[PDB]
């Protein structure tokens, strides 16, 4: 990990990086997710796994650095959005540029949030029994996760 | 037009895997059928209604014994969907005059000739 | 289309049920349905139907 220092003269210093735990359980896996047998076994709640692919201010790291495949990169990206919206990453908040403070508006607790709350409109005509409009819960990208329920998860609430 | 249906013969030609699944030998075929009505003939065509009465299956879930001969089988194929056909099995042999009054038909399809209502011990 | 039919993992198919009158199904089926085998409904063609 290299950091740029300015003085004009500016230079970048490379520092030693923490090393991955050796001897993955499943060597020969391309994606780092499959070298540890995590293909379908992580959700938004798993901050410990998700945090590793996140920039200090909450952005996702580029795929070419993480080494994830596209299928798992998109799942990590979506899980991170849901984790952020659930307030599970209090230390990866956006940087405040200058003369900006947090909105101070009270925070509503939410989880399994597919979309940004700003841009989702209210359902004014909810519909009757068979034309009921569904409130989406979870993400479609995680439709293949291992399920421990008798029936598949109820995405539309 | 809803009409009587003729099933292609291939349906009733079994496969080797079928014998393993149901545990029936293509040789030494079973002799007697155990047939029970498990559906209603209401909303079914009259020809299906007729055979069910001919075969004695007017009451549901009450078993009837029938011959495993082609003529009877032809009638059963007409109402195949309304019945369950189970092979009659005789673990201890045919009932005799002495044991005719001590028989019992088990749900397994076996006609025992001695029924004690006691622990096996 | 041919590959889908061969590798289908569903034991039950429209053709077998229709031809054998399983479930008493032909009460609710047209005479032409046996030929179509569920692929064609009215003037519509269903490619995903094997």
């Amino acid at each position: 990990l290299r950091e740029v220092v300015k003085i004009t003269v500016i230079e970048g210093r490379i520092t030693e990086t923490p090393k991955a735990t050796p001897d993955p359980p499943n060597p020969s896996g391309q994606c780092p997710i499959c070298r540890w047998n995590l293909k379908h076994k992580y959700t938004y709640e798993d901050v410990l796994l998700l945090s590793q692919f996140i920039r200090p201010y909450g952005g996702m790291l580029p795929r070419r650095v993480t080494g994830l495949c596209r299928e798992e990169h998109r799942k990590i990206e979506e899980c991170v959005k849901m984790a952020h919206r659930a307030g599970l990453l209090p230390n990866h908040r956006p940087q405040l540029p200058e003369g900006c403070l947090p909105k101070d508006k009270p925070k509503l607790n939410r989880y399994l949030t597919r979309w940004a709350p700003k841009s989702v409109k209210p359902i004014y005509k909810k519909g009757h029994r068979w034309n009921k409009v569904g409130m989406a819960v979870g993400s479609p990208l995680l439709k293949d996760n291992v399920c421990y329920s008798r029936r598949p998860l109820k995405m539309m609430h | 037009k809803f009409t009587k249906s003729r099933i292609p013969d291939k349906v009733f030609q079994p496969k080797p895997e079928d014998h393993e699944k149901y545990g029936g030998d293509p040789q030494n075929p079973h002799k007697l059928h155990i047939v029970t009505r498990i559906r209603s003939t209401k909303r079914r065509p009259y020809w299906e209604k007729d055979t069910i009465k001919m075969l004695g299956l007017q009451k549901a879930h009450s078993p009837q014994i029938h011959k495993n001969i082609p003529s009877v089988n032809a009638k059963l194929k007409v109402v195949k969907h309304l019945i369950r056909i189970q092979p009659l099995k005789l673990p201890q042999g045919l009932p005799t005059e002495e044991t005719m009054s001590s028989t019992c038909l088990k749900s397994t399809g076996e006609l025992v000739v001695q029924w004690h209502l006691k622990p096996v011990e | 289309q041919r590959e889908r039919e061969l590798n289908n993992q569903n034991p039950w198919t429209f053709e077998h049920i229709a031809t054998a009158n399983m479930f008493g199904i032909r009460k609710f089926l047209s005479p032409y349905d046996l030929t179509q085998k569920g692929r064609y409904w009215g003037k519509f063609y269903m490619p995903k139907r094997v």
Binding site: W130, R151 | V11, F12, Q13, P14, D18, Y22, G24, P26, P29, H30, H33, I38, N68, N73, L76, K77, K80, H81, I83, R84, I85, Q86, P87 | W12, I17, A20, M22, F23
Partner: peptide, 27 residues
């Protein structure tokens, strides 16, 4: 009208019973 999960299974169970009926009428 989407077909329910319970409705689909109960038809399959009946089909299997009739499927066996084919086998026992073949000998």
């Amino acid at each position: 009208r989407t077909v329910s999960f319970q409705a689909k299974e109960s038809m399959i169970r009946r089909l299997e019973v009739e499927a066996e009926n084919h086998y026992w009428l073949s000998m």
